[PDB]
């Protein structure tokens, strides 16, 4: 299956992969000053990656399905959306865009919150397009969708 990663980078098991290079996760980058859960109406800015926020310390963007979002989070993630766990969906009416985020198959998608509340990614290029939803998490660990600018 594919890896989670620990605060400092390391693969928890199985073996590393780099992240796509166009990609909002950029490596490496800390994390995991504090687990911080966010609402989605409340999602961090770019400006408070330097300094925080209220609710606490930010290092980017995390997500699993509930759909459950963090601007910080210090136990195990995945770099890469797990496209295992991940089931093909018709396109949704999205509620927010999320990131830029590499598959499991080495791909980039686009990442989209809908309104069901799923989490669906959707191929960045037109060939060999596919739309997918986050339909298992066998893991209960978030995706590092993006990091703020070092």
């Avoid at 990663?5 to 590393?16: H, Q, R, S």
């Avoid at 995390?62 to 759909?67: A, I, M, T």
């Avoid at 009416?93 to 669906?120: A, F, P, Q």
């Amino acid at each position: 299956m594919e890896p989670l990663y620990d605060k400092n980078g390391a693969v928890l098991f199985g073996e590393p992969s780099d992240t796509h290079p166009q990609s909002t996760l950029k490596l490496p980058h800390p994390r995991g000053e504090k687990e911080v859960i966010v609402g989605i109406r409340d999602l961090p800015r770019k400006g408070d990656c330097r300094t925080g926020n209220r609710l606490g310390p930010v290092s980017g963007l995390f997500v699993k399905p509930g759909p459950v979002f963090y601007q910080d989070y210090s136990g195990p993630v995945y770099h890469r959306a797990p496209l295992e766990q991940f089931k093909q969906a018709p396109m949704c009416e999205v509620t927010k865009r999320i990131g830029r985020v590499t598959g499991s198959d080495g791909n980039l998608y686009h990442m989209y919150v809908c309104t069901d509340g799923c989490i669906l990614v959707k191929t960045a290029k037109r060939e060999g397009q596919d739309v997918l939803k986050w339909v298992y998490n066998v893991l209960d660990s978030p995706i590092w969708v993006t990091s703020c600018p070092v």
